[PDB]
A paper describes a structure:
N-methyl-D-aspartate receptors (NMDARs) belong to the family of ionotropic glutamate receptors (iGluRs) that are involved in the majority of fast excitatory neurotransmission. NMDARs form heterotetrameric ion channels composed of the obligatory GluN1 subunits and GluN2 (A-D) and/or GluN3 (A-B) subunits.
Importantly, little or no effect was observed when IgG2 was applied to the oocytes expressing the GluN1b-GluN2A, GluN1b-GluN2C, and GluN1b-GluN2D NMDARs, indicating that this inhibitory effect is specific to the GluN1b-GluN2B NMDARs. To understand the underlying factors that contribute to the different effects exhibited by IgG2 and IgG5, we sought to determine the binding site for IgG5. Together, these two structural analyses delineated the binding sites as well as protein conformational states in the context of the intact NMDAR channel. Shown here is the crystal structure of the GluN1b-GluN2B ATD complexed to Fab5 at 4.54 Å. Although both IgG2 and IgG5 bind the GluN2B ATD, they do so at distinct locations.
Residue numbers in the entry:
A (entry chain A): 23 to 96, 102 to 185, 209 to 396
B (entry chain D): 1 to 215
C (entry chain C): 3 to 133, 138 to 221
D (entry chain B): 32 to 52, 62 to 321, 331 to 378
The structure:
């Protein structure tokens, strides 16, 4: 008899339950299940983090899951990590892009099909290369996502460089002070990374400083171009959006395929051991887990539906395709896209 | 035991502009994890209503115009933009040590354009002198600026010995004030004169506004 | 919601029980408070009580002097004040909750406590008409009463726009106030205006109508 | 006088008849638990919440299972709940806690432990050294404490090389081995979990760095149950730990109840209430009164960071006979 592999998911709605069941059964039909069968067990999000953790133990750990897919609900994936990370079971996100989840010091075994907000910065660099923007003023919020954006940018400039960096604590409404400093400086390509409730104040209290007009190149990510942050935004600002960013159907499709590939790779290996069945009493960890995580790190798919997909060393989505945006009449104009490796114009 | 210093104690702001009250405490009233204050407001004859919840927290039912700020020992209440609906005394509170206290209070009186009073003179009623006393009542019913100055004249000469002057504070629909002048006297003195005149000094006219009656 | 009841005026060293009606929430889960507005318009905390009596707090100013009670079934907030001093004259409010949870969320409307030896006396109400009509001013004089408060309304409150009601002043033993009405004159000589006064201290209601002098 | 309910959760048979020997009243229950794991610990604690109102837990075990603290932090953050980790895995120092958590631990902070290790390294002129860590929290904090002390050193400590090893990933490459060869310095400082120290010392053994001419200093997060040294460890190791030999369990249990009850007394005496238990499966004001604490003649204050301001330390050597030896206090 073929030994049967359990693959689990914590998704948004019943619909995505069925999409996952589907993609798993198709993953059985993509190669000679020469040694393995793929079985789909799926649940949806639970109210508070306690029920989230216990439900993963009750529904998924209870049936020897090798991996869990986690999406954004209709509470972010953390309690699942904090549980499956205990057993060193790989948690794979489909939609949450908060960079805190790449730091496997806290999220001991986390990876995803979406880039962090902190990763958006790569496109920023490439555009500076095409307009010769060798001096920039970086303005990040002092929440952890903005701090991460800071470091991930300053690594890439080691040619062009940051002129200055301004640190801005969220919740502040009178953002005038840092904008005063930023206008005092000389460079005229400004990068912003903050939360929405703060980006909207940025643009409100910045438009009053006559920084709406030409001469201020504005680079900005997906967080700071949505909702109220877009309402008061200046004409000509340049923005980014994630390709198939919430097409959760597409994300589940792409994810299941390469989980299957990696299982195949794993079970032509030697000295493989089984994941625990049920969380209770299993004080020792899954011992094959680290190997499976290493395998996921090196898996590759060329015909991705959300883009060519493979990973970086922290477990982050690489080659994410982006939408590069301009504003005319308070109307959103795509001037280009990011193919994942280089910028393509319209 | 903790003290509270509200500053300023009273102010005047144009409609649409910002307004700021603040307060200082003898001690730190916050932790490195959270902060513990609250604000309240007072219109005339009013149930005091909560304005700010913890430190920078808009109450479930007060307009977005209000916002708080601060920590440690300096806390601030901000009103942008200011309405006449906000005419009010304001009180500052902490909830750290066992004696929860209030500030001394601070007044918000709205900046308003000139407005002359409705002067109405009233002789005593036909039922008042049925006991022996009498009064001439002047209503200066609606005016701004605040500081008006009123005088009664019997037969044309001065008498201020027995006048009761009562004031309302700023009416929140008008942004104006009003005054009740009660000249009290008995049958004996009233019977001995004929002309009761009321003059008022206001920023409105170099002349006093006057109304009177004969007997 | 909530409303106070049971106020009035009593003598030094005596006692008075205030209580308030409760409506619309699970009374047995909130923390209840009693606060003082001194007539000088400063607020002060008088007493607080736990979800059910487990801690009765008073500042040392009225500790022993006052006592709080709760009825968790009949939803009543209760406070008896005893061994009173002249210091305890104030407007007293009921306030409540922050749910784990210190601040005073929601507030009552306040009942007046006057601490003095003086005797109750209702007011006399003398109507007031002038001695156009663009538009017309009428009034009511409420003279010679004690203690506070007194209530002035008009045409059973169907008349609820241009009203100026004044604070009373302490002339001697008694308070005296007045109430001014301004209405479109298209109705003064037709739909005639009367005034309604109430003094709950003497538990009295008064009703008087308006006529010139005559004519 | 009103009271407050508290539970004492223990894994392993302990003292009963013998660890029993004001301004508010305490109420203690004893709950044994057969298991330590996410599911079981969560389950029993919330079960205690729904059968009776409980305002705090003192948690102690006799294991090295560090994840206990990790888990307990989670639990505390979720239910507005004080949790004391007074021994075992509960006392393994948990860094990067939730900003809302009310979980506190006995034992020294990482800051103090690096401090003590440097006090030691001066004792033996070990002014050359290197640092090896994994990804386990406190990692950044440890090496930054040390580097900060070196920048303000009037002696030239040769922080020769410093290494990061990824232990969430496989070592079929021997990338851990290759990294460890960057170490030539006599003294090496290892910060990770006890388990990881086991694997890493198999490696450091396989490349001769456990050999003598080399000496290792490792904090209390690897000493653990100071009675257990697996057959995979070298000797001549040095560690710091909570002096669990001269500060017994009855003392720490007495401290555990008295912290919580003193906090209850003062908060209720001044704000007139003690928060009602969330049996669900709002202010942490208690934290203020849980930071600065005093009882029956003892300083039981925690740092605003969330660790004891006065941990009692012992400095120990893994010796001739593979048993930890008091060498200093």
């Amino acid at each position: 008899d073929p030994k049967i592999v359990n693959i689990g998911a914590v998704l948004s709605t019943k619909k995505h339950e069925q999409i996952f069941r589907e993609a798993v059964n198709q993953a059985n039909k993509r190669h000679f299940t020469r040694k393995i069968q793929l079985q789909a067990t799926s649940v949806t999000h639970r109210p508070n983090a306690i029920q989230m953790a216990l439900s993963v133990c009750e529904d998924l750990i209870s049936s020897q899951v090798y991996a869990i897919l986690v999406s954004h609900p209709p509470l972010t994936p953390t309690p699942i990590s904090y549980t499956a990370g205990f057993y060193r079971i790989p948690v794979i996100g489909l939609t949450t892009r908060m960079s805190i989840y790449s730091d496997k010091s806290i999220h001991l075994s986390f990876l995803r099909t979406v880039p962090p907000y902190s990763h958006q910065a790569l496109v920023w660099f490439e555009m500076m290369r095409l307009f010769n923007w060798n001096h920039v003023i970086l303005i990040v919020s002092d929440d952890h996502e903005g701090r991460a954006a800071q470091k991930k940018l300053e690594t890439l400039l080691e040619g062009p460089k940051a002129d200055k960096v301004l640190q801005f604590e969220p919740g502040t409404k009178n953002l005038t002070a840092l904008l005063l400093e930023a206008k005092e400086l000389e460079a005229r390509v400004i990068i912003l990374s903050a939360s929405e409730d703060d980006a909207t104040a940025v643009y409100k209290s910045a438009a009053m400083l006559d920084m709406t007009g030409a001469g201020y190149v504005w680079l900005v990510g997906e967080r700071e171009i949505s909702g109220s942050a877009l309402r008061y935004a200046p004409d000509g600002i340049i923005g980014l959006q994630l390709i198939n960013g919430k097409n959760e159907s597409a994300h589940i499709s792409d994810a299941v395929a390469v989980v299957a590939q990696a299982i195949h790779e794993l079970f032509e290996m030697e000295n493989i051991t089984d994941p625990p069945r049920g969380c209770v009493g299993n004080t020792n960890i899954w011992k094959t887990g680290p190997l499976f995580k290493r395998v996921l790190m090196s898996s590759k798919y060329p015909d991705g539906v959300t883009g060519r997909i493979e990973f970086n060393e922290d477990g982050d989505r690489k080659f994410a395709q982006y939408s590069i945006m301009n504003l005319q009449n308070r109307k959103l104009v795509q001037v280009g896209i990011f193919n994942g490796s280089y910028i393509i114009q319209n | 035991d903790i003290q509270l210093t509200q500053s300023p104690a009273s102010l005047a702001v144009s409609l649409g502009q910002r307004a700021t009250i603040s307060c200082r405490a003898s001690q730190s009233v916050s932790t490195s994890r959270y902060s513990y204050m609250h604000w309240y407001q007072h219109k005339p004859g009013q149930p005091p209503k909560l304005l700010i919840k913890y430190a920078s927290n808009l109450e479930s039912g007060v307009p977005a115009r209000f916002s708080g700020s601060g920590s440690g020992t300096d806390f601030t209440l901000n009103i942008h933009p200011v309405e006449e609906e906000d005419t009010a005394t304001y009180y500052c509170q902490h909830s750290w040590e066992n004696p929860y206290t209030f500030g001394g209070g601070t007044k918000l009186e709205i900046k308003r354009a000139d407005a002359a009073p409705t002067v109405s003179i009233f002789p005593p009623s036909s039922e008042q002198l049925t006991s022996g006393g009498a009064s001439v009542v002047c209503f200066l019913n609606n005016f701004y600026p605040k500081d008006i100055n009123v005088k009664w004249k019997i037969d044309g000469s001065e008498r201020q010995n027995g006048v009761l002057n009562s004031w309302t504070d700023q009416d929140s629909k008008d942004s104006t004030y009003s005054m009740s002048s009660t000249l009290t006297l008995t049958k004996d003195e009233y019977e001995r004169h004929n002309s009761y005149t009321c003059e008022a000094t206001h920023k409105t006219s170099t002349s006093p506004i006057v109304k009177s009656f004969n007997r | 919601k909530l409303q106070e009841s049971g106020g009035g005026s009593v003598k030094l060293g005596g006692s008075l029980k205030l209580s308030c009606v409760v409506s619309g929430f699970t009374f047995s889960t909130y923390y209840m408070s009693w606060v003082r507005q001194t007539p000088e318009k400063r607020l002060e905390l008088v007493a607080v009580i736990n979800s059910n009596g487990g801690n009765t707090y008073y500042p040392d100013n009225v500790k022993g002097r006052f006592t709080i009670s709760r009825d968790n079934a009949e939803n009543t907030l209760y406070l008896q004040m005893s061994s009173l001093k002249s210091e305890d004259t104030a407007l007293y409010y009921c306030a409540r909750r922050d749910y784990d949870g210190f601040a005073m969320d929601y507030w009552g409307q306040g009942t007046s406590v006057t601490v003095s030896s003086a005797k109750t006396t209702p007011p006399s109400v003398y109507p007031l008409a002038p001695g156009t009509n663009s538009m017309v001013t009428l009034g009511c004089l409420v003279k010679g009463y004690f203690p506070e408060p007194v209530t002035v309304t008009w045409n059973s409150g169907s008349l609820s726009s241009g009203v100026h009601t004044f604070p009373a002043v302490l002339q001697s033993d008694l308070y005296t106030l007045s109430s001014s009405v301004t209405v479109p004159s298209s109705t003064w000589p037709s739909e005639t205006v009367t005034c309604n006064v109430a003094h709950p201290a003497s538990s009295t209601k008064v009703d008087k109508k308006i006529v010139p002098r005559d004519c | 006088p009103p009271s407050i309910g508290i539970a004492v959760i223990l894994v392993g048979t302990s003292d009963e008849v013998a660890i029993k020997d004001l301004s508010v009243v305490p109420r203690v229950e004893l709950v044994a638990m057969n298991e330590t794991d996410p599911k079981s610990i969560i389950t029993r604690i919330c079960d205690l919440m729904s059968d009776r109102k409980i305002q705090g837990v003192v948690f102690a075990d006799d294991t090295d299972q560090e994840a206990i603290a990790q888990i307990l932090d989670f639990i505390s953050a979720q239910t507005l709940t004080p949790i004391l980790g007074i021994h075992g895995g509960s006392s393994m120092i948990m860094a990067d806690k939730d900003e809302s958590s009310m979980f506190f631990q006995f034992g020294p902070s990482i800051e103090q432990q690096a401090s003590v290790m440097l006090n030691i390294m001066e004792e033996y002129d070990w002014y050359i050294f290197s640092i090896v860590t994994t990804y386990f929290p406190g990692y950044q904090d440890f090496v930054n404490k040390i580097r900060s002390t070196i920048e303000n050193s009037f002696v030239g400590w040769e922080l020769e090389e410093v290494l990061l090893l990824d232990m969430s990933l496989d070592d079929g490459d021997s990338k851990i081995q290759n990294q460890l060869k960057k170490l030539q310095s006599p003294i090496i400082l290892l910060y990770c979990t006890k388990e990881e120290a086991t694997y890493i010392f198999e490696v450091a053994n396989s490349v001769g760095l456990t050999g003598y001419g080399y000496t290792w200093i490792v904090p209390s997060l690897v000493a653990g149950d100071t009675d257990t040294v697996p057959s995979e460890f070298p000797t001549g190791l040095i560690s710091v730990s909570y002096d669990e030999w001269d500060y017994g369990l009855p003392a720490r249990v007495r401290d555990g109840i008295a912290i919580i009850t003193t906090a209850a007394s003062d908060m209720l005496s001044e704000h007139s209430f003690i928060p009602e238990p969330k049996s669900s499966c709002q202010s942490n004001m208690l934290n203020r009164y849980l930071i600065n604490v005093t009882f029956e003649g003892r300083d039981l204050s925690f740092s605003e960071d969330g660790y004891q301001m006065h941990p009692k330390l012992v400095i120990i050597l893994l010796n001739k006979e593979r048993k930890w030896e008091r060498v200093g206090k």
